[PDB]
Design a protein around this motif. Structure first.
Motif, short mmCIF file in Angstrom:
data_model
loop_
_atom_site.label_atom_id
_atom_site.label_comp_id
_atom_site.label_asym_id
_atom_site.label_seq_id
_atom_site.Cartn_x
_atom_site.Cartn_y
_atom_site.Cartn_z
N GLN A 8 0.85 -1.23 0.00
CA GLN A 8 0.00 0.00 0.00
C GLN A 8 0.87 1.26 0.00
OE1 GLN A 8 -0.73 2.57 2.10
NE2 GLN A 8 -2.64 3.27 1.17
N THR A 11 0.95 4.82 -2.23
CA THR A 11 1.04 6.19 -1.65
C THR A 11 2.12 6.99 -2.38
OG1 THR A 11 0.14 5.61 0.50
CG2 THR A 11 1.59 7.53 0.43
N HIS A 37 1.10 7.83 -5.85
CA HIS A 37 0.08 8.90 -5.77
C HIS A 37 0.73 10.26 -5.47
CE1 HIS A 37 -2.95 6.14 -6.68
NE2 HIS A 37 -3.44 5.88 -5.47
N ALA A 76 0.50 13.51 -7.75
CA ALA A 76 0.19 14.81 -7.11
C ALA A 76 1.18 15.87 -7.61
CB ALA A 76 0.19 14.69 -5.60
N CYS A 114 0.26 16.82 -11.07
CA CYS A 114 -1.00 17.62 -10.95
C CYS A 114 -0.67 19.06 -10.51
CB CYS A 114 -1.98 16.97 -9.98
SG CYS A 114 -3.62 17.75 -9.99
N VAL A 115 0.33 19.24 -9.64
CA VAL A 115 0.81 20.58 -9.17
C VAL A 115 1.45 21.33 -10.35
CG1 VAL A 115 2.52 21.77 -7.71
CG2 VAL A 115 1.00 20.08 -6.71
N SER A 154 -0.31 24.69 -12.08
CA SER A 154 0.51 25.92 -11.92
C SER A 154 0.91 26.48 -13.29
CB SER A 154 1.70 25.69 -11.05
OG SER A 154 2.24 26.93 -10.63
N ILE A 162 -0.41 29.99 -14.79
CA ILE A 162 0.64 30.99 -15.15
C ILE A 162 0.51 31.37 -16.64
CG2 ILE A 162 3.14 31.20 -15.60
CD1 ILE A 162 2.52 32.01 -12.78
N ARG A 173 10.58 23.46 -17.76
CA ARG A 173 10.37 24.37 -16.60
C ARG A 173 11.64 24.52 -15.75
NH1 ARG A 173 8.23 27.77 -13.98
NH2 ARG A 173 8.03 27.74 -11.71
N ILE A 232 14.97 4.17 0.69
CA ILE A 232 14.40 5.55 0.64
C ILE A 232 15.14 6.43 1.66
CG2 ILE A 232 12.40 6.94 1.36
CD1 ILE A 232 10.62 5.01 -0.21
N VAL A 238 2.58 33.78 -7.90
CA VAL A 238 2.11 32.41 -8.30
C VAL A 238 3.32 31.53 -8.63
CG1 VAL A 238 0.91 31.08 -10.12
CG2 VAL A 238 -0.26 32.96 -8.99
N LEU A 248 4.81 28.25 -6.49
CA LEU A 248 5.12 26.92 -7.10
C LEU A 248 6.60 26.59 -6.88
CD1 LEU A 248 4.24 24.45 -8.84
CD2 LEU A 248 5.17 25.70 -10.80
N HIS A 249 7.50 27.54 -7.15
CA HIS A 249 8.97 27.38 -6.91
C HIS A 249 9.22 26.98 -5.45
CE1 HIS A 249 11.60 27.92 -10.35
NE2 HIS A 249 10.80 28.89 -10.82
N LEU A 287 8.12 22.90 -2.97
CA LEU A 287 9.02 21.76 -2.63
C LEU A 287 9.76 22.02 -1.32
CD1 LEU A 287 10.11 18.98 -3.61
CD2 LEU A 287 11.99 20.24 -4.67
N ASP A 293 -0.44 5.43 10.02
CA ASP A 293 -0.23 5.69 8.57
C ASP A 293 -1.14 6.84 8.11
OD1 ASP A 293 -2.35 3.93 9.07
OD2 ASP A 293 -2.04 2.73 7.26
N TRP A 309 -0.17 8.95 5.65
CA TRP A 309 0.14 8.96 4.19
C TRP A 309 -0.82 8.04 3.41
CZ3 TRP A 309 3.37 7.21 8.06
CH2 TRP A 309 3.70 5.85 8.08
N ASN A 310 -1.58 7.18 4.10
CA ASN A 310 -2.60 6.27 3.52
C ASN A 310 -4.02 6.85 3.63
OD1 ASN A 310 -0.26 4.83 3.74
ND2 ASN A 310 -1.13 3.08 4.83
N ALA A 347 -8.11 6.02 -4.67
CA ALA A 347 -7.49 6.96 -5.63
C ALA A 347 -7.84 8.43 -5.34
CB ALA A 347 -7.87 6.59 -7.04
N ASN A 349 -7.22 9.86 -2.64
CA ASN A 349 -5.97 10.20 -1.89
C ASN A 349 -5.17 11.33 -2.55
OD1 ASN A 349 -3.95 9.94 0.12
ND2 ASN A 349 -2.78 8.50 -1.13
N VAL A 350 -5.06 11.33 -3.89
CA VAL A 350 -4.24 12.30 -4.69
C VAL A 350 -4.62 13.74 -4.30
CG1 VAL A 350 -3.69 13.13 -7.04
CG2 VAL A 350 -3.90 10.68 -6.62
N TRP A 378 -3.08 15.08 -1.14
CA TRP A 378 -1.63 15.30 -1.37
C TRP A 378 -1.41 16.59 -2.17
CZ3 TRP A 378 2.94 13.76 0.46
CH2 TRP A 378 2.98 12.61 1.26
N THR A 379 -2.20 16.81 -3.23
CA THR A 379 -2.18 18.05 -4.05
C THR A 379 -2.51 19.26 -3.16
OG1 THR A 379 -2.64 16.96 -6.12
CG2 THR A 379 -3.30 19.27 -5.98
N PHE A 436 0.33 19.89 -0.82
CA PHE A 436 1.50 20.48 -1.53
C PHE A 436 1.36 22.01 -1.60
CE2 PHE A 436 2.99 16.63 -4.37
CZ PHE A 436 3.70 16.10 -3.32
N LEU A 437 0.24 22.51 -2.13
CA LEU A 437 -0.09 23.96 -2.16
C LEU A 437 -0.36 24.45 -0.74
CD1 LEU A 437 -2.18 24.49 -5.41
CD2 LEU A 437 0.25 24.07 -5.08
#
Ligand SMILES: CC(C)c1cccc(C(C)C)c1NC(=O)NCC1(c2ccc(N(C)C)cc2)CCCC1
Ligand SMILES: CC(C)c1cccc(C(C)C)c1NC(=O)NCC1(c2ccc(N(C)C)cc2)CCCC1
Ligand SMILES: CC(C)c1cccc(C(C)C)c1NC(=O)NCC1(c2ccc(N(C)C)cc2)CCCC1
Ligand SMILES: CC(C)c1cccc(C(C)C)c1NC(=O)NCC1(c2ccc(N(C)C)cc2)CCCC1
Ligand SMILES: CC(C)CCC[C@@H](C)[C@H]1CC[C@H]2[C@@H]3CC=C4C[C@@H](O)CC[C@]4(C)[C@H]3CC[C@]12C
Ligand SMILES: CC(C)CCC[C@@H](C)[C@H]1CC[C@H]2[C@@H]3CC=C4C[C@@H](O)CC[C@]4(C)[C@H]3CC[C@]12C
Ligand SMILES: CC(C)CCC[C@@H](C)[C@H]1CC[C@H]2[C@@H]3CC=C4C[C@@H](O)CC[C@]4(C)[C@H]3CC[C@]12C
Ligand SMILES: CC(C)CCC[C@@H](C)[C@H]1CC[C@H]2[C@@H]3CC=C4C[C@@H](O)CC[C@]4(C)[C@H]3CC[C@]12C
Ligand SMILES: CC(C)CCC[C@@H](C)[C@H]1CC[C@H]2[C@@H]3CC=C4C[C@@H](O)CC[C@]4(C)[C@H]3CC[C@]12C
Ligand SMILES: CC(C)CCC[C@@H](C)[C@H]1CC[C@H]2[C@@H]3CC=C4C[C@@H](O)CC[C@]4(C)[C@H]3CC[C@]12C
Ligand SMILES: CC(C)CCC[C@@H](C)[C@H]1CC[C@H]2[C@@H]3CC=C4C[C@@H](O)CC[C@]4(C)[C@H]3CC[C@]12C
Ligand SMILES: CC(C)CCC[C@@H](C)[C@H]1CC[C@H]2[C@@H]3CC=C4C[C@@H](O)CC[C@]4(C)[C@H]3CC[C@]12C
Ligand SMILES: CCCCCCCC/C=C\CCCCCCCC(=O)O
Ligand SMILES: CCCCCCCC/C=C\CCCCCCCC(=O)O
Ligand SMILES: CCCCCCCC/C=C\CCCCCCCC(=O)O
Ligand SMILES: CCCCCCCC/C=C\CCCCCCCC(=O)O
Lengths: 375, 375, 375, 375
Positions: free
Chosen positions: C19, C23, C26, C30, C33-34, C38, C42, C200, D24, D220, D224-225, D228, D263, D265-266, D347, D349-350, D353-354, D357-358
């Motif tokens: 699982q 994750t 996904h 994501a 998708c970002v 974006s 833009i 990019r 990882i 904007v 995005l920059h 991360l 978990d 992240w699940n 699915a 879940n995405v 996460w999106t 991220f923002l």
């Protein structure tokens, strides 16, 4: 081994019942129907009967000068052999016969300025009569040398479609006059087809040879343009004078043994091509030159014995052509030899068909050139 | 009655073993060998590859614009039927599919100035895909109307040589790769033969239509001069794209039932000619227009039901031609109708062959006229 | 020891069910998708499809020049081995084959000014075909040397995801078309992800290399700024062309043995890294260079035998790069050697990952420099 | 239902043995090793210790002012409850305690101009102490209302990694000092990683906000920059202060029940995301607000009961931020609400996460803007 006669039927005839060949036959009649409709519709705004009326110029005189030659070849050899088989002057009579149709058909050909067609009639008739007269002689003579052939059988034989004399000729019950009527209708149709080809796709391309500076552009391209008339001319000669005409006479005379041509179109080996094309003249040439050459020479080596048959075959055809159109130059002697040399010694089937296609493409072109360079 | 599939072999193939047809086959290869030797020997003092390089101008772009159309006609119909058989938006998806290959191959055809050959590729592919996509839909839909077709069978069917969708397709043990290699070799040979005909006996006679005062002397005689290219073009289309090509694919895919054409050359009745020429498209047109018209109308009188199939058959071919050479005037619509009217209602076999010969003689001439009057 | 094939499943696939990896999968979608939201938001106030349309410039001509190379590498080797196993001219045929895809894809690459992407297509295809053509030859030849491989198996093998020729290839019951549809969807998604990275976070930082006085401030900082594009480029190549693409084809062709990559991310020893990254090309290189070098040399010392495989592996990649972007200077030759020397001989796992990160950080920067210094 | 304690081990720890996660983990340490080598090699021709020395400005005074607050929260509540459980003035004492760490850490924060880091130390410590002091109170009080908790258990509880007071706390046999040494080494490593991110990929892009005309091109694209850095900041907070730090203390104190995070992240449902992220503060908030709100209101409708927990959760975080960087404007109140409203009700879940991220990409950017607009 001398030929023995059986009651087999002409291969194309028994094949002509299989349906797909009736289709091909109908496709070719459609081809004729297209030429007649198109020529009619064009020349209406008459026909190319120009050739038929021209080519058959003195046809009356041709037939009236055929008659005495036929009467001579009928009487002379029989009377000669009949007196000669009573123990005379026969030796002079048959020689006088050999002269009476060796000079007469040349005299009447040249001295009266005959057209080509009515010339080809008499030249064919003189070779025909020479061949079968001599055939009868060489058959009957050995029977006489003990220390009389039936006349009716001779006269019959003189019209029989084969050149071998057997005075047996195993025959068929009766005569299907519907079938002979069909055969002569097809033969006339074939002559009309050949007339259309020579009138339309042969002459108009070749009339303009007065405008030639000895270039190879109006010779090679013209030869290729004229290869298809060439193949149709040959293949129509085959159908008209070996399945329409000879089968019609083989019907009228109740003559069995109608194998004038085996499947030549299947011939893989070129020896097979000589063996199974025009089997009547092949049978004469085989029986009376090859099997007599082998006897005369007593030769284990056929190497000189054969090339005798080929040489006689080569001069006979050039004599005919040279006679028919009055042309001193032999092409089909040199072409006959060069094609002989190529197919004889040098799926293989294709090469024969190719070297036959140009084998015609050359003949027509090189003749229609000098038929107009002389006119 | 819907068609049921059996393991019979393509009539010409089992016939191709009978020796006389191997002879005819070899005679036609001899014909090709004569064209290649003569064109070589002439143009040496290069080839007519002018047409092949020209006609296949943007063949790269043609295949790369074929790919997405194939991907669309693969995916769209299956996905649509699949969700539609889960009870959606499919009604829009199949309509979007009906657009994506109705506009795209016209856009890429006109707006990029494509040559004829690489135009005929895409136009055949779009009709092909429309026909068999719709065929699959109308087969699978009635199965869904109870108060899922296997995908592998669909993708297979999309390449199968038949337009009827059965998802059974009775198959042969294995694949004779020697036989398929031979078949594609013959197909390429056929394309080279057609190239030689269009490069030698079609264009040189028709290049000079700039010197025409609307006279009927350079139209009727030209039509007759071009009837033989016409018949060879049609008969090569038959052999190349119905016995070389479709049998090659019927081999590669282990597909039985190779009856793409029964004996059309035997067809006495013209109904039989429609029945036994290009039996694949005939089977589609019969199953999905005639037997559906009869159902929709419920008509005892087929009089309006048939002439529907004929009308669709008439517009489809004119659409193709009009598309392929960019010609707004239909000839083979009017010719199709006038030949229909003649052979349908007005040894009989000959007339069909005659009205086919001019049936081609017209098509080629009347096109090579306006293919140069536009250039 | 030659490789023997088993029915194990691709490690990441059986792992993709656990699982936590779904994750991570996904989390990366994501990320995509970002970028799409974006870039949309833009460039609305269109997309970086500039690269896709540019990079795939003559893709039509690329696929149409791929076709003949594929036809040649299909036919030539089989026909050559087949006649060579009948006792000929094969020695010339395979050499002609070795030429026809050694010159053609270089000619069509340089003399038509191809963009990078539609260049990389053909260069991959030529190495691919060389590798597996030679593979088949060296497999089948020893079978012939007794004092015929099945063709269908060869054409199959030519599309099989492995470079070893076995003509056994132990297969799976059927084809999960849902799974292959998913795999190709992911492969296309991966190409879009790579496009976004190069459009990019790679180009905008490197477009401005026209303003460089040979300072080390815009080289080292730029290399670190470009290490992350580097790692994503490599890791997307891994996922797209070793788990998305090759598993999709290993599904479509019912091919078992889907071990294209063992756990490379676990590799402690660097020998293990070479062993378990891209196992298909590793297996070819191992079987046909190492285990053949050992045989040819008969060398107890592999010291010269290995560094042969490494040298071929080193020139192949530099040939590809030098070809794809038209760059005469090798970097990944010198980098390949310097990384080889470091990880081969000089929790250890970290150092490999570090020397891989800069292993990418260098490649991208040093190329995007000269890709613009040439433009 | 009040929480009952079991001897389960922290999910990531038992997962950290599975090999692919060790990979990882090593990949992320490689990422650190790349930053340290590159920053070293760049800034040599020193480090970004600028932040660490700056951010920890008055850390001595921060710890020296932490001490009395700890002494007060230790003594005051116990003495208050002990006298109050002898039948006094406790009501004043615990209120004086509520004041002594509600004013002191604000006074010492503002009046002495503290940097951000050494401010975040004290603000975390004051919320921490308030939460667990009140927790102990509300646990011990109901035991007193019959018509004395062990001190050692209280002092222990004040250092225990959980906010629920149980004075049982089921414990482990002994203390793996190797494991705690590793955990604190990782925690320090995480702080160094976060320092590098804020020093390299956060500040240099955001230092130049003095050159902004209220355009949306540098907001904007900058967001995005900076997404991360955002995700790494959050995920490092997770690993450092929920698996490195709290597990280290859960080891040192022999504390069982190490389920600080299931978990997350699940988490498919967002309720599950609140349930399984930072389970210690979740458990306090659940036990002492939700399950007490339900009791106080007696409400069948949790609709007002929940959104109480969310409102306290919303003000607490904004209080912290507003305190730590001295910013009066709440963003993460409005973002907290707008993300709440989106993931809670609107699915799968995405999307989480999106919108996470923002959820970070916004936080960092909108702060680093006003952290410099105030400086
Ligand atoms: C057709 C010809 C090339 C040929 C090929 C192979 C073998 C022979 C003979 C030995 C039987 C011939 N020649 C022949 O048969 N001559 C006589 C005939 C003949 C045929 C064609 C030609 N032409 C070539 C016009 C001339 C005479 C047969 C039908 C009419 C007379
Ligand atoms: C050949 C044509 C006049 C004809 C006669 C009788 C019945 C049909 C159909 C209903 C099967 C057709 N039309 C056809 O078959 N069109 C499709 C194809 C076709 C054949 C010839 C032509 N031309 C006349 C060039 C066009 C298309 C078949 C082979 C390639 C596609
Ligand atoms: C990735 C590379 C450094 C590497 C490391 C270790 C071992 C190998 C081989 C001997 C299997 C390679 N090279 C490779 O696999 N080349 C072929 C491919 C390749 C991969 C990456 C790159 N780049 C570095 C862009 C080039 C080719 C694999 C996927 C596409 C073709
Ligand atoms: C990460 C945050 C958006 C979030 C999501 C979902 C649920 C919660 C609570 C109710 C457990 C939080 N908030 C939290 O846990 N705050 C406390 C801490 C925290 C975490 C991140 C942040 N930032 C967003 C910087 C602030 C505080 C946990 C680790 C350090 C303190
Ligand atoms: C009656 C008029 C129109 C003349 C017709 C001539 C046609 C029907 C005759 C004359 C010569 C014959 C052809 C000569 C030999 C062959 C080769 C063989 O492998 C197939 C049949 C085929 C092709 C014959 C079919 C019938 C044929 C074409
Ligand atoms: C197309 C044009 C030139 C017409 C051609 C007419 C000539 C060449 C054709 C038509 C009729 C044919 C003749 C009819 C039958 C016979 C009787 C036979 O015992 C000798 C051959 C002979 C004499 C034929 C020779 C060739 C022939 C004369
Ligand atoms: C391989 C290249 C040279 C193309 C060859 C085409 C030839 C061999 C093919 C194509 C079309 C075929 C013909 C079409 C139909 C008929 C009518 C039938 O009553 C006799 C056979 C015949 C005449 C076929 C013989 C073989 C054929 C002529
Ligand atoms: C003689 C010159 C003009 C060459 C002619 C080339 C064209 C007309 C020929 C050559 C190859 C043929 C194509 C090859 C096979 C196919 C695939 C089929 O699914 C649709 C028809 C199609 C596309 C054919 C249409 C006609 C075709 C394109
Ligand atoms: C589908 C599009 C968005 C591309 C997605 C790429 C992702 C899902 C793939 C490509 C490469 C894969 C990674 C490569 C190898 C590792 C190292 C291992 O220790 C953990 C899993 C992990 C991290 C894989 C997870 C899945 C992965 C990240
Ligand atoms: C991000 C931008 C540059 C897009 C990159 C496009 C190129 C580099 C990618 C996209 C699709 C990929 C190709 C798709 C599959 C194949 C077939 C295989 O047998 C050889 C490699 C090859 C040809 C791949 C090489 C790399 C590739 C061509
Ligand atoms: C020690 C220093 C370098 C910090 C290292 C942080 C790394 C090792 C930690 C911190 C946060 C953790 C990640 C957070 C949660 C997930 C999502 C899960 O689906 C895969 C594992 C993964 C991706 C964890 C792997 C280990 C992890 C990445
Ligand atoms: C990257 C730069 C800004 C360094 C950041 C330093 C700050 C933000 C980090 C480093 C060490 C962390 C602290 C260490 C442990 C504790 C004790 C705990 O009871 C409250 C939180 C608190 C006080 C942490 C809060 C966040 C923290 C102070
Ligand atoms: C070699 C040169 C060719 C000679 C042609 C010979 C033709 C075959 C010979 C005889 C069979 C002919 C029998 C039927 C024709 C009778 C017609 C008539 O007498 O008018
Ligand atoms: C009426 C218009 C004529 C339409 C032509 C239809 C041709 C017959 C249809 C399908 C059988 C073809 C199957 C083999 C071709 C595969 C080649 C390819 O996909 O490129
Ligand atoms: C060392 C240089 C790298 C060469 C790349 C080789 C790739 C692996 C080789 C073969 C497996 C590919 C099989 C599936 C691809 C079929 C696609 C196609 O033919 O267009
Ligand atoms: C909601 C705002 C977040 C508040 C953070 C609370 C952190 C979790 C609380 C207590 C567990 C911490 C126990 C170990 C830390 C001891 C360190 C020390 O006293 O210096």
């Amino acid at each position: 081994k001398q030929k023995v006669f059986i009651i087999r039927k002409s291969l194309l005839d028994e094949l002509m019942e299989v349906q797909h060949f009736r289709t091909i036959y109908h496709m070719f009649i459609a081809g004729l129907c297209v030429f007649i409709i198109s020529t009619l519709a064009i020349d209406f705004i008459l026909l190319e009967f120009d050739l038929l009326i021209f080519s058959f110029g003195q046809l009356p005189l041709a037939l009236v000068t055929w008659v005495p030659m036929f009467l001579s070849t009928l009487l002379a050899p029989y009377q000669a052999l009949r007196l000669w088989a009573r123990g005379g002057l026969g030796c002079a009579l048959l020689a006088a016969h050999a002269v009476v149709l060796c000079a007469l058909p040349v005299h009447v050909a040249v001295e009266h300025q005959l057209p080509p067609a009515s010339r080809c009639v008499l030249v064919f008739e003189q070779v025909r009569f020479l061949m079968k007269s001599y055939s009868f002689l060489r058959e009957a003579v050995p029977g006489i040398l003990r220390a009389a052939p039936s006349f009716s059988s001779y006269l019959y034989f003189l019209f029989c479609p084969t050149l071998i004399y057997r005075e047996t000729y195993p025959r068929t019950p009766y005569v299907r006059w519907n079938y002979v009527a069909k055969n002569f209708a097809q033969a006339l149709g074939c002559v009309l087809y050949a007339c259309f080809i020579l009138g339309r796709l042969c002459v108009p391309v070749f009339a303009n040879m007065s405008r030639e500076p000895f270039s190879t552009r109006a010779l090679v391209l013209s030869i290729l343009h004229a290869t298809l008339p060439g193949i149709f001319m040959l293949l129509l000669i085959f159908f008209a004078f070996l399945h329409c005409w000879l089968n019609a006479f083989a019907e009228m005379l109740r003559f069995g043994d109608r194998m004038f041509y085996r499947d030549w179109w299947n011939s893989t080996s070129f020896s097979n091509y000589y063996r199974t094309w025009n089997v009547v003249v092949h049978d004469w040439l085989y029986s009376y030159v090859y099997q007599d050459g082998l006897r005369l020479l007593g030769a284990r080596a056929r190497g000189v014995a054969m090339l005798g048959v080929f040489l006689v075959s080569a001069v006979a055809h050039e004599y005919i052509f040279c006679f028919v159109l009055g042309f001193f130059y032999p092409v089909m002697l040199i072409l006959f030899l060069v094609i002989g040399g190529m197919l004889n010694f040098m799926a293989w089937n294709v090469l024969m068909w190719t070297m036959l296609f140009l084998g015609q493409g050359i003949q027509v072109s090189l003749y229609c050139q000098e038929w107009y360079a002389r006119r």
